Design a protein around this nucleic acid. Structure first.
Ligand code: CA
Ligand code: CA
Ligand code: CA
Ligand code: CA
Ligand code: CA
Ligand code: CA
Ligand code: CA
Ligand code: CA
Ligand code: CA
Ligand code: CA
Ligand code: CA
Ligand code: CA
Ligand code: CA
Length: 94
RNA sequence: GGCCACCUGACA
RNA sequence: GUCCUCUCC
RNA sequence: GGAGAGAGAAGUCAACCAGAGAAACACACCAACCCAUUGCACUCCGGGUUGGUGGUAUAUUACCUGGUACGGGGGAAACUUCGUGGUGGCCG
């Protein structure tokens, strides 16, 4: 169990040394094929570092990305992916 | 005339 | 040039 | 946010005013390391160690150049030159 489908996928266990700009660029290049991405959020503060939220336009895209990219080697660490527990503001105010 | 502490005051 | 309270805009 | 005032930490300084005038300290940010973090967010923003950069600190408190109130000289005189916090203790 542990999550119902959502537009946004939560990714963690990311390499904490990658600068924010580069991380976002790589995440975009790797997840682009699944569908349109409305935004990608990454912060390197104490609590959000090592994590990222990739907001997809279509839920189905979130799903295919989650299934296909689970454990994918990224900057030498296998990515961990799950649906976001709640909608991202952009999706909620939409 | 030096040195540490403290006091008063200037700066802030 | 930090920080705290007060006044005013 | 901004503009005033009080309180003042840290640090520098010492009769006092003025002109010039750094440094120290605080604060902000950047870089590299180290430590911590496996964290579900949508208002930046963990800690430490080095190094660096910055400010209406465009400050003022040393240093400097002028004078002021006292005190040391010389000079009939004009005037010219030396010295300028409190207390206890330690080092010739
Ligand atoms: Ca950050
Ligand atoms: Ca948080
Ligand atoms: Ca929608
Ligand atoms: Ca203010
Ligand atoms: Ca002055
Ligand atoms: Ca000045
Ligand atoms: Ca100056
Ligand atoms: Ca934990
Ligand atoms: Ca929220
Ligand atoms: Ca430093
Ligand atoms: Ca400095
Ligand atoms: Ca300046
Ligand atoms: Ca001033």
């Amino acid at each position: 169990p542990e999550t119902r489908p959502n537009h946004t996928i939560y990714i963690n266990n990311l390499n904490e040394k990658i600068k924010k700009d580069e991380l976002k660029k790589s995440l975009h290049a790797i997840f682009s094929r699944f569908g349109q991405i409305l935004d990608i959020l990454v912060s390197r503060s104490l609590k959000m570092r090592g994590q990222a939220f990739v907001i997809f336009k279509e839920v189905s895209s979130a799903t295919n990305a989650l299934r296909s990219m689970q454990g994918f080697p990224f900057y030498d660490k296998p990515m961990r992916i799950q649906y976001a527990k709640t909608d991202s503001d952009i999706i909620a105010k939409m």
